[PDB]
């Protein structure tokens, strides 16, 4: 179950954990924590 969603343009933010780019800073913060915590959540949407 490996997803791949690439946009366009070097984002000012990058997750130094997996390797994903985020346009908004707020979003990243959420993702970061998302990593840890297994609550009926495995596969991603996009
Ligand atoms: Zn990440």
């Amino acid at each position: 179950g490996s997803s791949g969603s690439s946009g366009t343009g070097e984002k000012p933010y990058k997750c130094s954990d997996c390797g994903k780019s985020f346009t908004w800073k707020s979003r990243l913060r959420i993702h970061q924590k998302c990593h840890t915590g297994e609550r009926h959540s495995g596969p991603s949407s996009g």
Side-chain angles (χ1 to χ4, degrees):
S2 76
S3 66
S5 62
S6 70
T8 183
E10 198 271 25
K11 274 86 203 196
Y13 313 110
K14 182 204 170 286
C15 190
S16 196
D17 271 21
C18 50
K20 175 181 184 200
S21 288
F22 306 64
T23 306
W24 286 106
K25 194 171 159 178
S26 277
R27 301 279 85 156
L28 171 70
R29 284 165 88 156
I30 301 156
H31 167 86
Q32 279 182 338
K33 66 161 83 167
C34 197
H35 276 296
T36 189
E38 209 79 51
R39 187 77 72 85
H40 281 93
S41 191
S44 274
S45 182

